Symmetry: C2
Subunit: 240 residues, 2 copies
């Protein structure tokens, strides 16, 4: 992995502290604006829905791709959702329940198999990824996503494929994006939260893996988690 | 399958002779503008890339979802096809030569077997292994397309779940958190004024926790009318509240 400090320009205009990791073809060819931060580990927040969904399917907690999660202070948490819907929209109770049913022993087992961050799930079985001790780096997110892309995670190919379709966020004949956002909450200047955007882009016959994170201490800065990576990817010729 | 005559309103303007079949939840609850035409069989054209892809994967002709179909640098009928393509790309751009080669490698015996398993139209593959779905004797109706697509959606085709899932992602054409469309077009040609070609749009829509299966075909003798294969069904679906 090489460092491209010229990418810092994109963070500076907004006084944002963050990192972008971009890899062409495989994780053996990565570039980042900040080597140090690229390997620093942060709360995954909702990016954890990816491993959580795979584990849910593997353990049988989630029956199949067509399972409907029925609603028994947020409007979104009062509607019926498909697996894809639960992943792509706010659905805190759904994944809290999935995590509880999976249980700490099984959860720990799968995060070991997945080499997922610091593999520290202390903090409560239904919130370790948001308020607990779990941390993962941008580099580790790219490695994890690459394994998923290739169906190399320790899970059935079927379940990996199911979760992959659930992650599709942009579609054109020769351009397909699988992605997932995360946000731990708006923190303060001295104690910021973290915001993420991770995924991969298939452009023609090439593939690019990416992971972005930034410190967030202002609610209005949240959209930068998509615009900063987009501008960098544009400059690399991926978007056009 | 009841008939919705009000839907003809979308066909009258362009003097289009066609049919739209729309099913909510399953093929046991369908509606159409034309009962007679709904079960009439036509050349699948480009919609055949769906079963062709599944069969290619099943027989091992296509290795897996990441197989690249390399361009040899030789002229193709469409400039859009003169490049390396993934399986999804080849389907989405309707790269005929890629699928003709797949069909050749599959072979008549295996092709026949799989179309029987899939209950695919008249199952007649006469006319040449690389042209039966384009210029040959293969025929399928709008109702049959919906039945076939429902099976695919449910992973009920006689093929691995893995392979059905691969082709499903390849068919995604519209994506939003609570709205997902899988679809494929077809266009046999303009034929003649007396014997016109056929245009298709088939697929399914997932909106919130509901699913809608659809199949559209129309007679076409002028290429300029092609976009109607998507606009007519879209207008009907939008009128039914099926929109993102």
């Amino acid at each position: 992995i090489t460092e491209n400090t010229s990418w810092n320009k994109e963070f500076s205009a907004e006084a944002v502290n963050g990192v972008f990791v971009l890899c062409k073809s495989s994780s053996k060819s990565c570039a980042t604006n900040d080597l140090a931060r690229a390997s620093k580990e942060y709360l995954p927040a909702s990016t954890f829905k990816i491993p959580n969904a795979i584990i849910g399917l593997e353990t049988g907690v989630i029956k199949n791709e067509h399972q409907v999660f029925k609603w028994d202070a947020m409007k979104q948490w009062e509607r019926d959702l498909t697996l894809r819907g639960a992943i792509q929209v706010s659905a805190v109770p759904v994944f809290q329940q999935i995590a509880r049913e999976v249980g700490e022993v099984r959860m720990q087992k799968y995060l070991k198999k997945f080499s997922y961050g610091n593999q520290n799930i202390s903090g409560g079985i239904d919130k370790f990824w948001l308020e607990g001790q779990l941390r993962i780096s941008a580099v580790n997110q790219v490695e994890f996503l690459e394994s998923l892309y290739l169906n190399k995670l320790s899970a059935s190919k079927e379940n990996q494929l199911i979760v992959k379709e659930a992650l599709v966020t942009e579609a054109a004949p020769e351009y397909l994006v699988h992605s997932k956002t995360g946000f731990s909450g708006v923190g303060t200047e001295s104690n910021p939260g973290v915001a993420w955007w991770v995924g991969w882009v298939e452009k023609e016959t090439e593939v690019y893996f990416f992971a972005f994170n930034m410190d967030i201490d202002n609610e209005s800065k949240l959209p930068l988690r998509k615009s900063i990576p987009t501008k960098i990817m544009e400059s690399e010729g991926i978007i056009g």
